Amino acid sequence: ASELLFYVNGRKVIEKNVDPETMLLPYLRKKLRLTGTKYGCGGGGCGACTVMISRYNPITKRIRHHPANACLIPICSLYGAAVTTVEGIGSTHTRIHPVQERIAKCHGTQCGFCTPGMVMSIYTLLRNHPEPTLDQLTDALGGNLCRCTGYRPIIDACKTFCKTPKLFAEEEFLPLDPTQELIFPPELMIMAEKQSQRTRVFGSERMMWFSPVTLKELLEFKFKYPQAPVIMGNTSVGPEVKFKGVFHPVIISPDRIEELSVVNHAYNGLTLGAGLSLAQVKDILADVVQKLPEEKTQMYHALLKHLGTLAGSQIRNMASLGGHIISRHPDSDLNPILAVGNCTLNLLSKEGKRQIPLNEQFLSKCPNADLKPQEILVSVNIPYSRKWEFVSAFRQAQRQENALAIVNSGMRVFFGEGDGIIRELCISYGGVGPATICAKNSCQKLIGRHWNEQMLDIACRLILNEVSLLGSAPGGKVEFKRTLIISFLFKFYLEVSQILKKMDPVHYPSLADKYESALEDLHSHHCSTLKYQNPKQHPEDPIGHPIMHLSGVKHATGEAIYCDDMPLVDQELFLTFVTSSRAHAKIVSIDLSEALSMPGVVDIMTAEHLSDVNSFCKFLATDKVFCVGQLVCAVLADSEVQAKRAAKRVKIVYQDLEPLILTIEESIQSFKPERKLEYGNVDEAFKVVDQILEGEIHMGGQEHFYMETQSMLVVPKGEDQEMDVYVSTQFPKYIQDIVASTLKLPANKVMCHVRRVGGAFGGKVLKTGIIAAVTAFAANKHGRAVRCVLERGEDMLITGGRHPYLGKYKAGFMNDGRILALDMEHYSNAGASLSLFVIEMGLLKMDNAYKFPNLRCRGWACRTNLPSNTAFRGFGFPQAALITESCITEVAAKCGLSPEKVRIINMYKEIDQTPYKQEINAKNLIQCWRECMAMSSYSLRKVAVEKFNAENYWKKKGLAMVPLKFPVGLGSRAAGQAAALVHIYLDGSVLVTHGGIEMGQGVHTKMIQVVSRELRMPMSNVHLRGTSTETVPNANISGGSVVADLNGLAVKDACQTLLKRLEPIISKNPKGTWKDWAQTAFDESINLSAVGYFRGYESDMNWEKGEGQPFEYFVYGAACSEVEIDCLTGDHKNIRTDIVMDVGCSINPAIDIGQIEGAFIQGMGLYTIEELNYSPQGILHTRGPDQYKIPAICDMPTELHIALLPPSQNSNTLYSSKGLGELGVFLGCSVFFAIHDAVSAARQERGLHGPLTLNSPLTPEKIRMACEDKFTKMIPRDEPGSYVPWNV
Amino acid sequence: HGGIEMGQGVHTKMIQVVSRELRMPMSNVHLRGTSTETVPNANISGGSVVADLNGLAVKDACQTLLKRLEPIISKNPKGTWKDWAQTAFDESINLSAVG
Amino acid sequence: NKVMCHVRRVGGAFGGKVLKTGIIAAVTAFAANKHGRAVRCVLERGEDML
Amino acid sequence: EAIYCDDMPLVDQELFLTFVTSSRAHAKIVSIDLSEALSMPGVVDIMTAE
Ligand SMILES: Cc1cc2nc3c(=O)[nH]c(=O)nc-3n(C[C@H](O)[C@H](O)[C@H](O)COP(=O)(O)OP(=O)(O)OC[C@H]3O[C@@H](n4cnc5c(N)ncnc54)[C@H](O)[C@@H]3O)c2cc1C
Ligand SMILES: Nc1nc2c(c(=O)[nH]1)N[C@H]1C(S)=C(S)[C@@H](COP(=O)(O)O)O[C@H]1N2
Ligand SMILES: Nc1nc2c(c(=O)[nH]1)N[C@H]1C(S)=C(S)[C@@H](COP(=O)(O)O)O[C@H]1N2
Ligand code: MOS
Ligand code: MOS
Ligand code: FES
Ligand code: FES
């Protein structure tokens, strides 16, 4: 019966007979047509769907504003509330909000897909704290991810709100007026001011949803429907119905019940309401901690510690305390702490009040200690700590926040007045089994003992077998988890054996001098500076100026249309895929009968239904699958919901096939084509060298993790089989080809149109086209527009990633570290299909900065039963150059020289020759290295790090510096050709287009800068809509770091042609407007339309001889990075990074510096935190701590300096600029080798010499286990083939 | 081109022009419509001369295109338009032309 | 450069789909822009002749 | 199968525009009352020359 009534952006919204399953994000986008709020991930991790929620408290008379992730909010929860999206706070056709203005004008948007989420997080925080500190702002953005910007420019935007040659004018940003903000809708105040007791009911065919608004009613509903979940935040129930096949016919979702949100400050402690958010609990406890003395606030400190890291701001503000406790997630950060602290739960039934203790049995879901099915959690009591009572909580995740714990803990000790005899002890752990578990038996055996090292050795033994994991444990990482268990035990020993020292100095011993640093942990502040140059040029010429991205403000306001933001076209269908669940198996059968009969389903296509158009230059699996994630079926339905429902009812029966090949080593057991480069004579050189060294390095893959998933709309016109394809891709011409081929049509019938892409980084080409081809086949077959958009989980599985690499090397060198001989082997892991291109660029760019006089280099791509890998930002360089740096730091080790001494003496001279016999001027390579050594103060900081490491046993620092020679160029002249089309209308305005695609790199911004210079008119007079095969035909891929270079030359070419035609008119009226010139040109029959064309940079390679001139120019750079590691937990912190870069003359230094930072952080992630976990069966793991993590704000180095070396003329390139964009990625390994250095310093001090090869990614697991100590030796281990592991 | 099809068959005639000038069947040529986005500043479709005038402009683009390709055509006179177009791309010859 | 006009075919015009057409398009586009909505205007025969 | 202008599919949330036309050949416009028209089902806006 009831009606749902809430507000969105100030406007009333009413739904009668609303479906309770409707989530807010699709509702905003589809029913309200507010497409600013974006889908990124659908689990609440990325923050792209961030909105503000406002609520009136009728008793306290206060409006509360909190951020939240719209993907997880069911609209039935919003009754009487006010939502605000990015569109609500301002727009270009009203007034822009300052948050929107500044994030854009500080260049805090690249692709722009993450920008609305960032804006709403910052907006919401400024609504709660009008005059904030940067701490609060960066805390608010803990939940918000970005794959393009590197966060620095978003941090700068935030700083302009904080009362504490640049790229932006801060002194012109309009001030935040806190009184002219959005008014809370008065109707909602009036509704709130009259507490209706009537409980609301919403139904559909599938689900009943009850919102009780009194406590009486809540208990009434909990009795009737005992098995119905009580939804508070939906951050536990929501994510598991989405991708764990769970469904609830009845939901109970209470409104603000006062008894559920109590905050009692008792004499013995405090009792906290079960319906308080985790964010509100963090605030209550922060205040209590400051208002009370610091031995009654022991529990409250451990809770604050873990709440600082728990998820981000949006999830904390949605998630309830009762939800957290009842969920009983094994990785829960708060439950293990509550477990140890004598906490009790206040239960309430229709039958009565009742109280149970929060213990292990409860956390294990033993029904004796559990809630009975008909009752609800009202509140929890957390008592004050007694004097001589101490509490500690630890955790380790993949990154420092917004990441689920691999292992965590809560631990308590009680001494009871004076003497160090332990009278009580509770030790609880998470991530070590199905639930949070307490080591009670170990704890019994330790009662009576003193606090000293005799008891540690035994305590460690007797927990390590009580809280054991089998080698085949879910979650993997067994030996790391084993270590963390006892390493946290050590840290607790230290910590509490110091508060004892503090409180009772004479009776207890002080800690060992090299141990103290183990206690305080690594927790950031974010500083940055930027040098670059900027007389002779006109002030109206925009070339060289840091012009804001043209869509920057549209990103900030959500007015930028990305592919899925396009409005629903009349009667469009949705397409979703059934993907393979086996890595190498026979397809015995497919049953579609159940799926085909379900609501909305129109058609389900297997490979039979594509017949002779199931492959191009195969799309759908025929009779075998060759990796997980391979396409098998295509389900076409009236909606996305119906499509996915029906897809999950398709039954495919398999039969596994041998061999199941997963690694590169397995793949070496017919004929693979070799590539080879040879310089000098390496076989002779291996006889005149002082020493020889063999080794190898594995390198992991990498997900593109563009924030916009794969997305397209295919629309048949209904005439002559014309299709229009709107798709997020980097290569429209290829989309046109594969769709036309699939439909058996000429290319003139199929047109591909692309306005913008929300990031691509190489991973929106081949696989995109397959999906478009299949999608277009369905569209054409049924005469319907068809939309296909992938969810994040499917996307990562179906699309590939970067190629994993194996490097083997034999290096002959001199005792001064110079490398005269080098034999080298590269192996890419290709996945199911071919990849050879990536090997070729690997080998050509392998040299990097160094002159190897004798070199044999050989590479092979290796097919496995994994998703087929694709090209990525860098194109083999980040892999290939890491092989050679690993080889250097090993040679450095064997010479007792720093790697940076070995690098500097193996570098190319000013003039020198590459392994492929191309001449190079490497002057700017030397300068880049000189200036980076000077700027960074490398030599002084080197002794500072050595000094530190001599004084600290459990925490080490490291420093590294790597150089960059990044060559640029494609295989042929034809691959570099580029075209444009320019119109001048009779009002003088200009429309330009070209074959390049805007993916967030600012190519369209740069082309208007070119047009503005060449025609001598303001950029406001030029306009560009998009890219289209209809306007500019035969365009090459938007790739190879040269999109702007090449399309810039073609745009310039059209402009000059146009200016030549007009020069008669211009000379005869030199003071006239473009409107006058255009008009008289028309009046004199002069054409105002012109194609522009650039033929391409000359380029070639004879791969037989290994010699050629493949590259047009070389980008030079260097980068220094400093880190501190925790040897007990494997954590690390990026302290500082320094980057110098030769860019020629930057066409736009804002955009070019944006690309350096973005690439650097992307490389930083590749080499440290980004990790793809596959099972022995080839299944990708995507849940719990197996979650893939891209770099967040907390990973961005505390200090960051970036210099652009002053220019020196490249007549061959566009305005002497050098195409950066992909370069910066390899510079991320400065962090890798800084960590490598830190680990070596721990291994030298402790005396473990010889072979240390650390592989990429350098994860916390790999760091910890490399810092061997008594705890690494102590842990129990397995035989290799005795168990089947969760991973590898 | 800038002409509008009102039922007088102007688009039919332009494909007839293209077919003669590039020496290819009309089945190989296609036209979607008219747009200020593709052809700017076009005059009214009126005065009994829409086909005459836009026909001369279509012919002009075709001839330009044929001049660029004549090297490729003389070197392979029995080749398809697919072959000529492909080798033109491979030799960095532009296949778009204003008339 | 912000406004583009696209025409596939006309079902006869004979001169009578120029000035008056443009006025109606101008008024129509003003409404569309004002309300952020696509707006369709099609005349019935009686109104059209008048 | 030939698409003429009104044959184009309905685009998401499009509105329709229709005109009130003059009923006199040469007259002064003393007044326009839109109050009844504006209150009726579906109506979004009514524009005069103002
Ligand atoms: C992106 C993301 C990141 C996260 N990161 C972390 C992290 O770093 N560390 C960590 O520990 N956790 C993390 N979590 C887990 C999160 O903290 C929990 O999901 C949350 O606390 C559950 O609260 P809720 O209100 O959303 O529970 P809901 O999803 O609303 O409910 C879950 C269960 O609780 C029941 N329930 C709720 N309230 C009551 C009550 N009063 N009485 C009886 N039953 C009740 C429901 O019936 C249901 O069965 C993360 C979650 C997400 C989505
Ligand atoms: N924001 C953003 N920057 C990006 C990309 C992207 O998808 N988004 N792609 C990268 C890749 S793979 C390439 S190959 C280059 C190509 O564009 P450019 O030649 O203009 O640098 O952009 C790089 N920078
Ligand atoms: N079917 C048809 N024929 C038509 C018209 C039309 O609208 N429909 N318009 C006429 C008018 S007014 C003119 S001015 C000419 C212009 O086109 P042409 O120059 O190609 O003859 O077409 C004439 N023939
Ligand atoms: O150069 Mo990477 O976009 S193919
Ligand atoms: O020539 Mo009549 O179409 S103006
Ligand atoms: S934040 Fe909801 S989409 Fe990831
Ligand atoms: S701009 Fe943040 S994701 Fe590309």
* Residue found by looking up tokens 């320094």 in the block: A1138
Contact partners of A by the rule of 3+ C-beta pairs under 8 A?
Answer: B, C, D
- Annotated binding-site ranges of C: 13-14
Q: Domain boundary residue among A755, A774, A799? A: A799
Q: What CA–CA distances, in Å, run from A500 to A295, A303, A416, A507, A1005?
A: 12, 21, 12, 9, 63
Set of chain D residues whose Cβ sits within 8 Å of the Cβ of C10? 4-5
Q: Is A522 annotated as a binding residue?
A: no
The whole-angstrom separation of Cα B37 and Cα B42 is 11
Nearest to A68 by CA among A340, A336, A277, A372: A277
For the record, the structure tokens of A999 come out as: 């993916």
Q: Which of B19, B32, B84 to mutate to test the interface with A (most CBs of A within 10 A)?
A: B32
CA distances from D44 to A31, A382, C23, D16, D17 (A): 18, 57, 21, 10, 10
A1092 touching chain B per CB within 8 A: no
Rounded Cα distance between B18 and C42, Å, is: 35
Task: Give the residue among A565, A471, A520 at the shortest CA–CA distance from A34.
Answer: A565
- Axis-axis angle for helices A923-936, A938-951 (nearest 10): 50
- Determine the residue type at A409: S
Distance CA(A283)–CA(A289), nearest Å, equals 10
Residue type, A680: G
> Angle CA(D35)–CA(D37)–CA(D43) in degrees, nearest 5?
115
B35 touches chain A (CB under 8 A): no
Residue A795, CA distances (Å) to A722, A829, A1283 in order: 28, 20, 31
CB-based contacts of A362-367 (< 8 A; 24+ apart in sequence)? A363/A328, A363/A335, A363/A339, A363/A435, A363/A436, A363/A437, A363/A438, A364/A435, A364/A437, A365/A328, A365/A435
Question: Which has the closest alpha carbon to A142: A25, A276, A282?
Answer: A282
Distances (CA, A) of A1221 to A416, A419, A761: 63, 64, 10
State whether A836 and A691 are in the same domain: yes
SS3 A792: helix
Instruction: Give binding residues of C for Mo-molybdopterin as ranges.
Output: 13-14
Q: In chain C, which residues are followed by a C-to-N distance beyond 2.5 Å, i.e. a gap?
A: none
Q: Are residues A133 and A165 in the same domain?
A: yes
Task: Verify that A664 and A649 share a domain, yes or no.
Answer: no
Distances (CA, A) of A1262 to A401, A483, A1121, A1167: 19, 12, 19, 12
Q: C-chain residues within 8 Å CB-CB of D11?
A: 38
Residue that has been written with the tokens 């009994």 in this structure: B48
Cis preceding-peptide flag for A336 (omega within 30 of 0): no
Tokens of A1254: 């650390």
- Taking an 8 Å cut-off on Cβ atoms, the answer to whether C50 and D18 are in contact is no
**Does residue C2 belong to the interface with chain A, where contact is any CB pair within 8 Å?**
yes
- From CA A1080, how far away is CA A1065, in angstroms rounded? 8
Interface test with C, best of D3, D19, D48 (most C CBs within 10 A): D19
Whether residue A850 is found in the same domain as residue A795: no
C42 touches chain D (CB under 8 A): yes
Ligand 7 pocket test, pick from A110, A709, A757 with the greatest ligand atom count within 8 Å of Cβ, gives A110
A1081 → chain B, closest CA residue: B41
**Domain around A129:** 89-192
Per-residue tokens: A879: 């892999």
Nearest residue to A1122 (alpha-carbon basis) of A941, A881, A964:
A941
- Asked whether the beta carbons of A756 and A720 are under 8 A apart, the reply is no
- The one-letter amino acid at A1206: P
Residues A53 and A28 in one domain: yes
Give the gap in angstroms from C-alpha C20 to the nearest C-alpha of chain B: 14
- Report the CATH number at residue B4: 3.30.365.10
Residue A691: HSE in the Cβ half-sphere, 13 Å Cα cutoff? 13
A14: enclosing H helix or E strand: strand A11-16
Burial level of A657, CB count in 10 A (0-12/13-18/19+)? middle
B26 labeled binding residue: no
Could you tell me the two tokens for A783? 């005469």
User: CA nearest A338: which of A272, A280, A399?
Assistant: A272
Q: In this complex, do C8 and B34 lie within 8 Å of one another by their Cβ atoms?
A: yes
A834 part of contact set with chain C, CB < 8 Å: no
- Asked if the Cβ–Cβ distance from A33 to D11 is below 8 Å, we say no
Looking at residue A1048, its amino acid is G
Domain co-membership, A202 together with A285: no
A180 and A94 share one domain:
yes
**Which positions in chain D touch A569 (Cβ < 8 Å)?**
9, 11-12
A1222 labelled catalytic: yes
Using alpha carbons, select from A614, A624, A618 the residue that is nearest to residue A587: A624
Q: In A283-318, which positions are buried (b, 16+ CB within 10 angstroms) versus exposed (e)?
A: ebbeebeeeeeeebbbbbbbbbbbbebbbbbbbbbb
Residue D14 forms contact with A (CB below 8 Å): no
Residue A234 CA to residue A320 CA, distance in Å, equals: 9
* Residue numbers in B near A1033 (CB within 8 A): 95-96
User: Which ligand does the CA of B55 lie closest to?
Assistant: 3
List phi, psi (to 5°) of A1095.
-80, -25
**A1121 and A1150, same domain (yes or no):** yes
For residue A801, report the distance from its CA to the centre of ligand 6, in Å. 21
Active-site hit among A1222, A1245, A1268, A1279: A1222
Total length of chain A? 1288
Q: What is the CATH number of the domain that holds A248?
A: 3.30.43.10
Whether A432 contacts A331, CB under 8 Å? no
Is the CB of residue A972 less than 8 Å from the CB of residue A1140? Answer: no
Give the tokens for residue A1193: 């704000």
Q: d(Cα A39, Cα A42) in Å, to the nearest integer?
A: 7
Alpha carbons within 13 angstroms on the beta-carbon side of residue A636 total 24
Break sites following residues in chain A (C–N > 2.5 A):
164, 524, 534, 617, 669, 834
Q: Return the structure tokens found at A987.
A: 């009002």
Q: Hey, are the CB atoms on B5 and C9 less than 8 Å from each other?
A: yes
| Secondary structure of residue A464 in the 3-state scheme | helix
Ligand nearest to the CA of B50: 3
CA atoms in the 13 A half-sphere facing the CB of D4: 9
Angle ∠(A1228,A553,A733) on CA atoms, nearest 5: 70
Coil, helix or strand for A200? Answer: strand
Question: Is residue D12 less than 8 Å (CB to CB) from chain C?
Answer: yes
Q: What whole-number distance in Å separates Cα of residue A189 and Cα of residue A185? A: 7
Q: Dig out the tokens for A465 from the structure.
A: 């077998």
Is residue A76 annotated as involved in ligand binding? no
What is the C-alpha separation between A124 and A867, in angstroms, rounded? 40
Q: What's the CA-to-centroid distance between B98 and ligand 3, angstroms?
A: 25
- The residue from A1099, A1119, A1144 where one domain ends is A1099
Q: Give dist(CA A314, CA A52) in Å, integer.
A: 9
What residues contact residue A133 under an 8 Å CB cut-off, 6+ apart?
A: A162
Q: State how far the Cα of B44 lies from the Cα of C5, in Å rounded to an integer.
A: 13
Residue A172 CB partners (closer than 8 Å, separation 6+): none
Q: Pick from A230, A301, A296, A289: which is nearest to A269 by CA?
A: A296
Closest CA–CA distance from residue C12 to any residue of chain D (Å): 11
CA neighbor of A74 nearest in space, from A222, A221, A251, A240: A251
- B7 CB neighbours in chain C (<8 A) are 9-12
Residues A826 and A805 in one domain: yes
Pairwise CB contact (< 8 Å): D14 & C47 = no
Shared domain for A1111 and A1224, answered yes or no, is yes
Short-list C34, D12, C28, CA closest to A561: D12
D12, D17, D22, D43, best to mutate vs chain C, most C CBs in 10 Å: D17
Q: Which atom of ligand 2 is nearest to the CA of A1043?
A: 19
Which of A108, A119, A118, A114 lies closest to A152 in space, CA to CA? A108
> Crossing angle of helices A453-464/A478-503, nearest 10°?
150
User: Are residues A1040 and A1188 located together in one domain of the fold?
Assistant: no
Q: For strand A711-716 and strand A990-994, is the pairing parallel, antiparallel, or unpaired?
A: unpaired
Give the C-alpha separation, A1066 to A1076, whole Å. Answer: 10
Q: Does ligand 6 have an atom closer than 6 angstroms to the CB of A315?
A: no
Task: Give me the number of domains chain A comprises.
Answer: 10
Residues A455 and A574 in one domain: no
Q: Are A736 and A703 in contact (CB under 8 A)?
A: no
Resolution attained, angstroms: 3.4
Q: A1252 C-alpha to center of ligand 2: Å?
A: 35
Gap between the Cα atoms of A1220 and A1143, Å rounded: 7
Q: Are C10 and B5 in contact (CB under 8 A)?
A: yes
Q: Is A804 exposed, middle or buried (0-12, 13-18, 19+ CB in 10 A)?
A: buried
